[PDB]
Amino acid sequence: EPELVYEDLRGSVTFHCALGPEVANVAKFLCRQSSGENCDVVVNTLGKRAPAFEGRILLNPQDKDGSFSVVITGLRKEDAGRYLCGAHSDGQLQEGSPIQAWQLFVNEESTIPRSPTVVKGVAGGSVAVLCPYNRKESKSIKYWCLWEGAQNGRCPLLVDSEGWVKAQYEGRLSLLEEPGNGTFTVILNQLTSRDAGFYWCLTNGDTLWRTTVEIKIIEGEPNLKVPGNVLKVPCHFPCKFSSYEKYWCKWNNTGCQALPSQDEGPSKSRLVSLTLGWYWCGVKQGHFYGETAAVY
Amino acid sequence: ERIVLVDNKCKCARITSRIIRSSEDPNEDIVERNIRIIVPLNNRENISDPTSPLRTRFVYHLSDLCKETCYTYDRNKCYTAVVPLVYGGETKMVETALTPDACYPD
Amino acid sequence: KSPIFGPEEVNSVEGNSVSITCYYPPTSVNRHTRKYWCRQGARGGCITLISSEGYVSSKYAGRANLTNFPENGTFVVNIAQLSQDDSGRYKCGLGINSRGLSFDVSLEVSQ
Amino acid sequence: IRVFAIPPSFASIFLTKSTKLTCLVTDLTTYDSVTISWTRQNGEAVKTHTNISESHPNATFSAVGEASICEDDWNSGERFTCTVTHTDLPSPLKQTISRPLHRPDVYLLPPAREQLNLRESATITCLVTGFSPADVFVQWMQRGQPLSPEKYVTSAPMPEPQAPGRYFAHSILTVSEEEWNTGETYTCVVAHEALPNRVTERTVDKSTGKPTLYNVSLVMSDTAGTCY
Amino acid sequence: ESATITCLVTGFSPADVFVQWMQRGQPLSPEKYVTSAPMPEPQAPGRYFAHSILTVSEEEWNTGETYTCVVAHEALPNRVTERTVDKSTGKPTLYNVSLVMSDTAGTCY
Amino acid sequence: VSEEEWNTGETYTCVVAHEALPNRVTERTVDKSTGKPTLYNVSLVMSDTAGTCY
Numbered sequence: 027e028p029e030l031v032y033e034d035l036r037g038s039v040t041f042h043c044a045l046g047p048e049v050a051n052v053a054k055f056l057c058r059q060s061s062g063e064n065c066d067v068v069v070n071t072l073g074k075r076a077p078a079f080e081g082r083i084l085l086n087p088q089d090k091d092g093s094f095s096v097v098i099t100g101l102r103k104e105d106a107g108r109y110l111c112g113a114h115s116d117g118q119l120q121e122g123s124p125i126q127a128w129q130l131f132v133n134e135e136s137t138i139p140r141s142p143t144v145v146k147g148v149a150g151g152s153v154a155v156l157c158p159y160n161r162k163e164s165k166s167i168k169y170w171c172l173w174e175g176a177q178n179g180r181c182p183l184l185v186d187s188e189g190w191v192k193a194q195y196e197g198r199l200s201l202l203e204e205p206g207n208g209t210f211t212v213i214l215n216q217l218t219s220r221d222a223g224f225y226w227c228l229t230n231g232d233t234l235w236r237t238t239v240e241i242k243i244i245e246g247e248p249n250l251k252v253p254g255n256v257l258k259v260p261c262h263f264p265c266k267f268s269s270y271e272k273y274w275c276k277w278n279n280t281g282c283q284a285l286p287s288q289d290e291g292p293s294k295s296r297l298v299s300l301t302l303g304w305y306w307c308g309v310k311q312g313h314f315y316g317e318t319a320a321v322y
Numbered sequence: 323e324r325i326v327l328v329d330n331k332c333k334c335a336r337i338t339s340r341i342i343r344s345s346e347d348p349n350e351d352i353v354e355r356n357i358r359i360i361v362p363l364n365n366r367e368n369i370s371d372p373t374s375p376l377r378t379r380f381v382y383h384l385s386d387l388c389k390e391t392c393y394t395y396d397r398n399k400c401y402t403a404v405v406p407l408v409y410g411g412e413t414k415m416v417e418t419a420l421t422p423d424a425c426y427p428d
Numbered sequence: 429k430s431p432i433f434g435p436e437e438v439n440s441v442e443g444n445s446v447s448i449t450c451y452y453p454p455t456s457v458n459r460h461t462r463k464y465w466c467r468q469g470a471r472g473g474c475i476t477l478i479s480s481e482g483y484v485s486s487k488y489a490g491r492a493n494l495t496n497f498p499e500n501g502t503f504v505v506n507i508a509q510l511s512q513d514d515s516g517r518y519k520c521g522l523g524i525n526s527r528g529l530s531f532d533v534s535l536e537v538s539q
Numbered sequence: 540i541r542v543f544a545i546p547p548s549f550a551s552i553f554l555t556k557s558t559k560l561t562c563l564v565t566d567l568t569t570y571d572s573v574t575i576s577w578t579r580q581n582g583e584a585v586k587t588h589t590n591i592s593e594s595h596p597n598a599t600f601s602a603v604g605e606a607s608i609c610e611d612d613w614n615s616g617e618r619f620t621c622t623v624t625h626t627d628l629p630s631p632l633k634q635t636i637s638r639p640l641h642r643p644d645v646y647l648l649p650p651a652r653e654q655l656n657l658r659e660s661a662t663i664t665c666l667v668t669g670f671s672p673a674d675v676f677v678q679w680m681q682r683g684q685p686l687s688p689e690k691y692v693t694s695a696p697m698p699e700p701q702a703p704g705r706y707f708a709h710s711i712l713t714v715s716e717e718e719w720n721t722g723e724t725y726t727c728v729v730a731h732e733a734l735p736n737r738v739t740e741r742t743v744d745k746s747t748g749k750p751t752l753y754n755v756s757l758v759m760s761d762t763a764g765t766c767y
Numbered sequence: 768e769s770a771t772i773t774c775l776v777t778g779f780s781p782a783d784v785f786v787q788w789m790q791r792g793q794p795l796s797p798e799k800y801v802t803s804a805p806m807p808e809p810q811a812p813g814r815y816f817a818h819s820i821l822t823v824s825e826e827e828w829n830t831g832e833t834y835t836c837v838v839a840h841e842a843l844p845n846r847v848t849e850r851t852v853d854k855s856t857g858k859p860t861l862y863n864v865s866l867v868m869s870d871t872a873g874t875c876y
Numbered sequence: 877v878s879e880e881e882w883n884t885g886e887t888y889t890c891v892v893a894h895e896a897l898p899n900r901v902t903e904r905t906v907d908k909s910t911g912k913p914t915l916y917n918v919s920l921v922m923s924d925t926a927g928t929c930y
């Protein structure tokens with residue numbers, strides 16, 4: 027029988043597939059019984075996924091009870107139907123397979139806000155994304171993620187709010203908190219062709235909207251000019267950032283602490299100084315954050 | 323199958339549209355304009371002041387609600403007025419609830 | 429489309445009891461507005477069998493209760509003592525009977 | 540012998556933001572040591588101008604210069620003078636170029652019904668009227684994707700018959716007629732100087748356009764007034 | 768305020784078409800309409816296209832009259848063709864009004 | 877014409893060549909759909925039981 031799951035538009039859903047010790051090592055799956063009799067399969071354990079669910083399905087690892095779980099995120103209006111986890115060998119829906127259905131409903135009357143799904147960053151540039159989270163659940167431990175396929179179904183932790191950043195991202199990465207009252211910002215610069223992908227805004231809250239944002243690493247030129255790898259250090263801002271407040275950081279696992287400088291007049295735009303690990307010279311627009319570039 | 327062009331909820335108009343994929347002849351497909359007004363007929367003119375005259379004219383310019391004086395209450399938005407009720411000495415002007423089950427504070 | 433969502437198909441033997449949950453988008457109107465469970469008959473309309481304000485019809489008296497969990501975001505209809513006149517076409521919904529905001533449960537009792 | 544000076548355009552400021560004042564020193568005597576210089580009114584020098592051309596097929600030398608200055612260093616009347624010295628020219632020859640508004644009303648016109656019965660090709664017509672002055676840009680995108688520039692054509696800003704000195708322009712895009720069961724919505728984005736974004740993108744599909752079947756359905760009811 | 772009716776002359780070869788804009792039979796002024804230049808076709812190689820606009824008031828289109836677009840080109844077998852528009856030059860448009868006055872039969876969210 | 881041929885299309889231009897026209901040739905046209913002036917059916921439903929949504 028159905029196990030009705032009323033979820034939200036641009037929210038997420040967790041299918042808790044619990045099966046038995048007869049079907050532990052059988053190759054589990056999740057079809058989606060559509061308008062005829064066929065199941066257009068969505069995950070597998072032997073490899074497959076969908077052209078649709080790219081970046082979003084997370085097939086969690088098995089337990090000792092065989093109770094693997096599946097996360098879908100960013101649900102859109104065309105996911106609103108019967109889903110079916112099951113355990114047959116060749117990963118298609120066949121008879122003899124201990125299935126266990128569900129039933130979604132993706133309501134369109136959401137209270138979830140509409141964050142942009144595609145962040146476009148130029149190579150060696152800057153991205154600054156906001157992940158929304160439940161305004162009741164303000165005091166909780168944020169996290170972030172990568173994307174690694176569905177048959178893997180992985181999402182290892184890049185940063186958090188307690189402080190621990192991965193070592194291969196240090197210097198170019200900072201989780202923020204401003205603006206509060208609903209959001210939390212993450213700034214990532216010093217981009218790369220292969221660090222485009224699907225990036226999940228976890229939180230340690232109770233009801234979770236695992237927002238997935240998509241980094242598109244285009245070709246480009248940096249919007250900000252900084253020395254290569256360097257007592258005064260300059261930072262050269264374009265004239266589009268005229269309202270934006272120009273400031274330097276001292277990066278650590280604790281984020282940005284302020285460091286003073288003095289402003290000039292017209293400079294071929296704007297130029298600031300660093301009179302005096304890794305440090306940046308980003309911009310700030312009132313309460314949000316924009317383009318930062320890193321230096322040694 | 324259809325796409326909502328307008329879902330206006332203070333006049334209660336609801337213009338949608340839909341292309342009818344016809345009998346499989348050439349492109350003699352039709353396009354629609356499914357307007358769906360719902361006329362109040364007991365709401366006042368000033369919707370919030372309920373001491374106003376009733377209504378006669380209901381004018382729906384369907385450009386000027388595709389891009390005010392509302393005719394219906396919206397269901398989610400909640401409406402109030404202030405009345406001079408007394409109880410003894412004072413005339414304590416307290417704040418009523420025209421449409422209830424929407425003005426419940428959290 | 430109307431955002432209530434219940435069970436589309438319910439099966440239960442005569443004498444046994446039914447629990448039918450229907451969900452709503454937990455707004456502050458939908459927490460507090462009237463929640464019904466009407467029987468869509470033939471030749472017309474809902475006949476409210478058990479509202480949530482406190483009406484309970486002549487038929488469902490003593491055998492039904494509708495409760496409302498507004499924080500869970502749902503309302504649940506318990507009906508004991510089924511018979512085969514309890515088969516047919518029902519709606520669980522909010523607000524007025526006519527104006528949509530509903531869902532269509534098809535109750536189907538077996539012997 | 541021609542020292543001809545082409546200043547840049549809004550279709551180069553919008554497409555590249557590399558605004559640059561150019562002069563071709565071509566058809567002169569086929570010789571080297573013809574030095575480019577781009578001189579302002581004030582006397583600021585310019586950047587590394589290279590990328591010279593080879594000899595003409597009619598046996599003359601062709602050369603080009605560059606001057607990449609900023610945008611409001613061009614809209615603010617900063618006159619430029621390119622100067623070159625030749626073998627026949629005992630003096631360097633100077634040639635100056637400099638800078639001498641209304642909004643565009645963009646309408647987009649679908650294919651006509653007579654054209655959609657030959658079952659061959661539908662030409663969607665952008666139309667950029669009532670603006671001044673000239674050199675607008677128009678580009679054609681299908682689902683957020685710049686289309687192939689050989690598939691569309693833009694006209695030139697010919698002057699308006701009614702309004703005095705306003706300039707209207709066209710552009711058309713020829714698609715398959717077979718596209719007009721499936722649509723793909725065909726955005727046409729203009730780019731003018733009297734705009735906030737300098738973008739006034741519009742779009743028309745088969746789903747837009749005239750209905751040829753209405754149906755008003757207005758219901759009336761004493762106890763309405765909540766508009767669910 | 769206004770209305771620019773446009774005339775789209777596709778698919779022809781060679782160049783040099785004429786386009787003129789008659790109203791009811793007497794041809795209009797040559798400062799009302801504007802014809803472009805001929806220009807080659809972006810899709811098809813051995814063709815061209817030209818254009819014209821005619822700027823009329825809103826009322827003179829919301830009244831009636833036709834504004835026909837008559838061209839001249841040396842491969843038509845009679846060497847003049849013409850088309851026309853009007854305010855009413857489209858299609859049928861059936862309306863389908865449906866006034867509901869029953870105070871019980873109600874609607875659908 | 878044959879009757880069904882008028883019931884398909886066939887814009888049927890009649891080109892009339894005079895020696896006193898403005899540019900010496902006009903031509904006019906008809907097919908079956910040159911009138912048909914907006915057939916509209918009103919439909920008042922009053923006091924009526926349907927149970928269908930409006």
Ligand SMILES: *[C@@H]1O[C@H](CO)[C@@H](O[C@@H]2O[C@H](CO)[C@@H](O)[C@H](O)[C@H]2NC(C)=O)[C@H](O)[C@H]1NC(C)=O
Pocket residue numbers: 368370371403
């Ligand atoms: C009648 O409508 C008027 C405007 O058409 C309403 O306007 C004012 O509304 C605000 C909102 O409650 C009040 O604070 C103002 O005091 C109103 N102005 C006046 C002069 O009363 C108004 O609410 C309606 N009339 C009444 C009596 O409520």
Ligand SMILES: *[C@@H]1O[C@H](CO)[C@@H](O)[C@H](O)[C@H]1NC(C)=O
Pocket residue numbers: 354356752753754756930
């Ligand atoms: C409007 O027209 C469409 C198509 O003709 C039809 O399906 C629909 O039922 C009509 N609207 C109403 C309210 O009946």
Ligand SMILES: *[C@@H]1O[C@H](CO)[C@@H](O)[C@H](O)[C@H]1NC(C)=O
Pocket residue numbers: 754755756863864865919
């Ligand atoms: C409008 O006409 C459509 C088909 O043309 C018909 O199905 C529908 O019932 C009509 N709408 C009404 C009566 O509201």
Ligand SMILES: *[C@@H]1O[C@H](CO)[C@@H](O)[C@H](O)[C@H]1NC(C)=O
Pocket residue numbers: 861863915917918919
């Ligand atoms: C209205 O007319 C159309 C065709 O003229 C027809 O399809 C439809 O059924 C009619 N409806 C009513 C209610 O008259």
